[PDB]
Amino acid sequence: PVDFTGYWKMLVNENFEEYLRALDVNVALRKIANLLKPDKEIVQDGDHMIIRTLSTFRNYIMDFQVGKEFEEDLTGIDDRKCMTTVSWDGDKLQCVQKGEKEGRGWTLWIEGDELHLEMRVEGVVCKQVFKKVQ
Ligand SMILES: CC1=C(/C=C/C(C)=C/C=C/C(C)=C\CO)C(C)(C)CCC1
Ligand code: NA
Structure with missing residues (x-):
């Protein structure tokens, strides 16, 4: 597959509030959260991965x-705690987070020089896009 390793800076964050509200994150924490611009620092060696948000x-x-x-x-x-599995889907990573909330998980992939993340829960979709600083 591909190598997701990199320091990826956030460019796009769509519908983050609705996603967090679906997770029952309280208003105070939601308030500070949508002013954040979380980045992804990823290190990978084959199937072993660390993703730091x-x-x-x-x-x-x-x-x-x-x-x-x-x-x-x-x-x-x-x-919360989930029973979580991240699986290869060709060159995409597909994550299912089993637990309280239905349809919870995410997809991570690279398109050109952009890292794309779709987070999902209960039919709510949040889109994030990142790029390395060239
Ligand atoms: C709300 C909230 C945060 C949410 C982080 C999330 C939702 C990360 C999702 C990562 C995924 C889906 C894949 C890579 O691990 C962080 C903790 C930044 C700051 C405190 C507020
Ligand atoms: Na931040």
Whole structure:
């Protein structure tokens, strides 16, 4: 597949508020959150990946093996736990987060020199796009 490794700076963040509200994030935390511009710092070696979502407020760190279900601790976001699997779908990464909220997960892929992220929960869609600083 491809190598997602890089420091990717946020360019686009669409519908983040609705996504966070669907996760029952409280108004105060939602308020500070949509002023953040979280970046993605990714390091990958084959199926082993660390995805760090970095913001000035709080970070969220994912560390996993593609194909292997793990207990995902979403402290800092909605403080839930999911039974999560990230899978290859050709050159895209497809993540299913099993738990309280239905249809929760995301897709990550590269189009040209842009990193694209679609986050989903309960039919709510948030679009994020990032680029490395050339
Ligand atoms: C609300 C909220 C945040 C949400 C982060 C999210 C929703 C990250 C999603 C990452 C995905 C979907 C894939 C790569 O791991 C962070 C923790 C930045 C700051 C505190 C407020
Ligand atoms: Na930020």
